[PDB]
Amino acid sequence: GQVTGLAWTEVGGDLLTIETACVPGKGKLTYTGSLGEVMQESIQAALTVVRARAEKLGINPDFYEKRDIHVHVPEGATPKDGPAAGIAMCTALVSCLTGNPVRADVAMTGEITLRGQVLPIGGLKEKLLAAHRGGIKTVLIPFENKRDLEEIPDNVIADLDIHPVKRIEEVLTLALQN
Amino acid sequence: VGQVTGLAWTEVGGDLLTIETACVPGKGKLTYTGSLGEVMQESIQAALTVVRARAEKLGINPDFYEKRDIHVHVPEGATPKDGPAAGIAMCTALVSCLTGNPVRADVAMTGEITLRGQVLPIGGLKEKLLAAHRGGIKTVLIPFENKRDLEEIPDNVIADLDIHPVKRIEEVLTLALQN
Amino acid sequence: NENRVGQVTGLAWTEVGGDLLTIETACVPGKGKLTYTGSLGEVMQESIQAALTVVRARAEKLGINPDFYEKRDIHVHVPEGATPKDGPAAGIAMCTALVSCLTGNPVRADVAMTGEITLRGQVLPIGGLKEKLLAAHRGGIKTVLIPFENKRDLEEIPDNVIADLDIHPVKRIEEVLTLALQNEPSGMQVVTAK
Amino acid sequence: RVGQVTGLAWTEVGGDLLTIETACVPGKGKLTYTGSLGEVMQESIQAALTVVRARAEKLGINPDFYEKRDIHVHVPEGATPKDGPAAGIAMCTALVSCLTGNPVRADVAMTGEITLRGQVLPIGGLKEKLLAAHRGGIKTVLIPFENKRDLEEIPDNVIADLDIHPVKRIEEVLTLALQNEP
Amino acid sequence: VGQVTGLAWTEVGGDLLTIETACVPGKGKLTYTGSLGEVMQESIQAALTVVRARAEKLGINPDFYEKRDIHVHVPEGATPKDGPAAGIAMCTALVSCLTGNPVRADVAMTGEITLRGQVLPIGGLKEKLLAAHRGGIKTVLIPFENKRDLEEIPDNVIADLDIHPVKRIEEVLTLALQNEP
Amino acid sequence: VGQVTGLAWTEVGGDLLTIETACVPGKGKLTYTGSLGEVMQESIQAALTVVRARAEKLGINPDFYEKRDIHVHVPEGATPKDGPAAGIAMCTALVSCLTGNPVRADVAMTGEITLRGQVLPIGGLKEKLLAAHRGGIKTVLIPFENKRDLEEIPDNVIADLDIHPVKRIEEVLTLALQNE
Structure with a gap:
């Protein structure tokens, strides 16, 4: 129930x-x-992806009738917005509802859609620089952000194991432990 | 999930x-x-009402709403958007969702929808068709009263696109759903 | 016909x-x-709420089952979607449409109407009558229902408008409905002979 | 007419x-x-309704009407903005009227702020209020008791034409205004 | 219906x-x-919670808040009011309402209430006690910590007043309710 | 009981x-x-989710969330309060309230709470502990990462407070509540 985005x-x-x-x-x-x-809306989107795919995820289709769900992003006082935490939101919900732990040294960025496709985001360099400083080993990015990997310092690309993903299934497979 | 290019x-x-x-x-x-x-939000409501009103002829349980939640989402999530032009797409996406009848991915559509299921003309036809053209779309559904606005669209765009002027939501669904 | 159920020109x-x-x-x-x-x-939203109350208050006369009603959702919409609309002048049209929708009673073709509705069923005069009638005239509307108290305002509207339009001044909503709908909404028809 | 009050x-x-x-x-x-x-006018309706709820049994009204009835209070003309607490006793009267089927008198107008205790409080602009009523043909006007001192600042010709009843409590209001005794 | 002069x-x-x-x-x-x-609105919620949490001690059927609807109104309706200083009045009024225990007519009160039932000091004690006096109020309840603020109000006004500094809600209710709570 | 100095x-x-x-x-x-x-209202939502998540281990009945009404009030009522630093205090108060377990006197605490139960560092520690000292608080619980900030604080203030740097909400309930 915890993911680095x-x-x-x-x-x-x-x-x-x-x-x-x-x-x-x-x-x-x-x-x-x-x-x-926009970040609030990405959470509703992420929850809808889970509900629509519950049977596939081994989750009881009627789980939202018997569950209360709280998504929180510390630090509580720092303003945050945008769609880039979309795949992280989805991953955290799947982890929580299944009990399947999330990989330790993985972070991810990307906008989610109801169809489960992962959409490119902006400020990738700033994002990958942040993960590099934090000692994150593996980063999931949207497939269409590959072009943006050019602007990134050589030493950062070299240190980071970057996975371009097209779909949420890819994200869950890579991020979850089981 | 239902999925339609609008x-x-x-x-x-x-x-x-x-x-x-x-x-x-x-x-x-x-x-x-x-x-x-x-205005876009209100078109979602109007679109949903059209389906609810035609549920039996569409092949949907009239009481589907008792046991279903509907989420309508229009990516890209951070891009501000407005207007009634996604109305027929919304109706199509909702019929697809509740029947499991896939939408043609080579078809895009534009048009305001009425509760009577009629398709009303939209503005910025040129803006829209250029996007459909540059987006690799083959077939475009447009409102019938927008036919006269096609005369100001670039020839190559008209040449590339299979535009289908439509009047009614029944025409839309036949042209856009795979079965 | 089916297409005329719940469709009203205000x-x-x-x-x-x-x-x-x-x-x-x-x-x-x-x-x-x-x-x-x-x-x-x-103000227009509030007119719709007034109009539905009027319907609900006259449901027995209108033959609308209170329990059927409670198992209906109602959606009033006014296209074009993007054009701002306001004022209480669509009150009797809203009521007409709601009665039509709830009873499957189609609205007569080529009728339009104007008038503020009250909970007592009274039809109150409206403003800008001249422009409203220019609007009806321009749209090939033949029969226009107006409030009985706007009758004095007819004098400033040209002869041809009055020659072309069939204007029925109305006092109460029961009259509107009888004039606007295909079947008589309120009451079983009794046939008598002298 | 049941459910109509001139305020x-x-x-x-x-x-x-x-x-x-x-x-x-x-x-x-x-x-x-x-x-x-x-x-403020909206809050007066909520106060008026509370007054009615508390007196429901005393008024012959089934106590649990607040759960079995939908209530719609409307003041034409729809486009004209109205505010203030002066329609309080009129809101209560119309509310009691409607719920009991007890017709309101058409020759009675009324003004006054209502409290949950059913008390009638003085209001403002009494001159405008009564001049209005007088041009309107109203025979009888109920005003708050403490508003009697304001009567001496309205023309003698207007007041002579009016049957003015100063009221202190809501039950007084109801007995003068309802066709049958509540 | 409960009524209290605050x-x-x-x-x-x-x-x-x-x-x-x-x-x-x-x-x-x-x-x-x-x-x-x-702030005045939240004072009402604080006041209500006090009554719920103390219901049986107050002699109130603990289940009252599913059997009762509650309306708190403060006339004159058009005059904007605010602040936490009517909190002990709100609570007295609720207790009176829910018990039928009349509130004295010669008593006025001012004070912020806490969930623990504590009375906290308020501001504007001068203008508050002048109003009480002009209205022919006999006894006034004020927060205990407002006692030194009495020395800023005219002695002629204060000498005419029976002033009762309170610390807790049970003091308020015992002083204000006509029968013994 | 249900009363916490934060x-x-x-x-x-x-x-x-x-x-x-x-x-x-x-x-x-x-x-x-x-x-x-x-931000303070949100801190309450977070603290409450923590309690819900741990209800069973906390001896609270799991279905309290539907059998109980909860009112969290922070006097003085007209004083505006904001920020995340009252998070651990909110959690402690809720646990104390739902368990009948009283909070220890002269204890105060500052810290941002996470849903996982990690205590996050806050700001204005100096001003916070000066208020604790004048409030006659003896024991103060701060976030582990606010340890650096104790250096910036007067010696007499450090002197009379029993300052406990905590990492998790389990330490917080153990140091703050009178029972387990």
């Missing part, structure tokens, strides 16, 4: 620790963390 | 958009997202 | 002027919900 | 004759308040 | 206020009206 | 907060009042 904050692209809790409940979605509206 | 006004970039609609286990909740302005 | 204010409104209503299976859209200003 | 209160064009309408059709307890009402 | 901030200034409270058959819904500002 | 940001008056909570039989309504800023 790369997304926009008040001070630039950054490592975010995305948290999701899925305690027994009645189907309420709470999300907090000084989130802007 | 042409509708966006604040930045092109007017070519993927209208997405999921119809998951739920209890009759509608969610709509995608940096949508109010 | 005359109210738009961002272009006091023009024609094609007022749409669907009554689909549901749970008692009312939705209204079409870039409506707040 | 005097402020509008954007001044303290004018108001026709307060209420409908109470069977529902689930929904409360709709329309007519370009300002927030 | 002293609290109004648009015109700190003044005499009749806090009303009705408690009819209901499903546990809370209504507050009277042009109340947000 | 140190967090205020517009005026000391950075000391008295956090009160009530947990009565109910249908599951959360009320939070006290002129609370959005």
Whole structure:
């Protein structure tokens, strides 16, 4: 129920620790963390991808009738917005609802869609620089951000194991431990 | 999830958009997202009402809404968008979702939808068809009263595109759904 | 005919002027919900709520089952979607459309109407009558229902408008419905002979 | 007429004759308040309803009407902004009227702020209110008791034509205004 | 219906206020009206919580907040009020309403209430106690920590007043309710 | 019991907060009042999710979220309060309230809470501990990473407080509550 994402904050692209809790409940979605509206919408999108694909994910199709879900992104006081945490949100929800832990030294950036495709984001360099400083080994980026890998310093590309992904299935396969 | 390429006004970039609609286990909740302005939001409601009103003839359970939640999402999520032009795409995406009847990926569409299922003309036909052309789209559905606006579209664009002027939502679904 | 159920031409204010409104209503299976859209200003939204109350208050006379109603969702929409509409002048049109939608009673072709609705069923005069009638005249509307108290305002509207339009001044909503709908909405028909 | 009360209160064009309408059709307890009402006027409706709820058994009204009835209070004309607490007793009267089927008298107008205790509080702009009523042909006007001192600042010709009843409590209001005794 | 004379901030200034409270058959819904500002609104919620958390001690059927609907109104409806200083009045009014224990007519009170039932000091004590006096109020309840603020108000005003500094809500209710809570 | 002294940001008056909570039989309504800023309101949501996640190990009945109404109030009511520093205090108060477990006297605490139960560093530590000291707080729990900031603080202040740098919410409940 914890994933490292790369997304926009008040001070630039950054490592975010995305948290999701899925305690027994009645189907309420709470999300907090000084989130802007586009980031809030990415969470609804990510939840809908899970609900639509629940059977595929070994999750009870009616799980949202018996679960309350809280997505929180610290630091609580730092403003964050944008769609780039989309695949991280989805991954955290799948982890939480399945009990399948998330890989330690992995981070990810990318906008999610209901169809499960992963869309390119902006400020990739800033994002990959943030993951490099944090000692992140593996980074998932959208397939269409490959062109942007040119602007990145050679030493950072060399240190990072970067995976361009097209689809959410790819993301879950790489990020989850099982 | 249902999936349809629409042409509708966006604040930045092109007017070519993927209208997405999921119809998951739920209890009759509608969610709509995608940096949508109010007129676009209201077209989602109108589109959903069209399906609800024609559910039996469409091959859908009239009481589907009791046991389904609907999310309508229009990527790219941060791109501000507005207007009624994605209406027929929304209706198509919702019929696809609730029947499991795939949409032709080589077809895009534009047009305002009415509760009577009629397709109304839209503005910026040129903006839209250039996006459809540059987006590699082969077939475009447009409103019937927009036919006279085709006279101001570049010849190559007219040459490349298979434009189909439509009047009614029945025409749209026949032209866009695979079965 | 089926296409005439829940479709009413009102005359109210738009961002272009006091023009024609094609007022749409669907009554689909549901749970008692009312939705209204079409870039409506707040005064117009309140007219729709007044109009539905009027219907609900006269449901027995109108033959609308209270329980069927509670298992319907209602959606009033006024295209074109992007054009701002406001004012209380679509009140009787809204009520007509709702009665039509809920009872499967098609609205007569080539009728338009204008008038503010009250909860007591009274039809109150409206403003900009001249421009509304220019709007009806321009759209080949033949029969226009107006408030009985706007009758004095007919004098400033040219002869041909009055020669072309069939104007029926109305006092109450029961009259509107009888004039606007295909079948008589309120009451079983009794046939008598002298 | 059941559910209609003539009230005097402020509008954007001044303290004018108001026709307060209420409908109470069977529902689930929904409360709709329309007519370009300002927030203070909206709060007066909620106060008026509370007064009625507390006196429900005393008024012959089934106590659990707040759960089995939908109530819609509307004040034409829809486009004219109305505000203030002066329609309070009129809101209560129309509300009691509707829920009991007890017709309101057409020759009675009324103004006054209502409290949950059912007390009638003095209001403002009494001059405009009564001049309005007088041009409107109203025979009888109920005013707040503490507003009697304001009567001496309105023309003698207007007041002589009016049957003015100063009221202190809501039950007084109801007995003068309802066709049958509540 | 409960009624209490509170002293609290109004648009015109700190003044005499009749806090009303009705408690009819209901499903546990809370209504507050009277042009109340947000801090005054939260004071009502704080006051209600005190009563719920102390219900049986107050002799109130603990399950009252699913059997009762509550409306707190403060006339005059058009006069903007705000602040936490009517909190102990709100709570007195609720307790009176839910118990039928009349509140004395010669008593006015001012004070912020906490969930623990503590009375916290308030501002504008001068203008508050002047209003009480002008209204012919006999006894006034103020927060204990407002005692030194009494030395800034005219001695002629204060000498006419029976001033009771309180620390806790049980003092308020014992001093203000006509029968013993 | 349900009463916790937390140190967090205020517009005026000391950075000391008295956090009160009530947990009565109910249908599951959360009320939070006290002129609370959005970030502080969110901190309450987070603290409550923590408690829910750990309800069973905390001896709280799992279905409290639907059998209980909870009102979190922070006096003085007209004093604006904001920020995340009251997070661990909010959690402690809720646990104390739902368990009947009293909080230890003269304990205060500052710290941002995460859903996983990690205590995050805060700002204005100096002002916070000055308020603790004048409040006669003896024991203060701060975030482990605020240890660096203790260097910036007067010697007499450091002297009279029993300052405990904590990493997790388990240390916080152990140091703050009178029972387990």
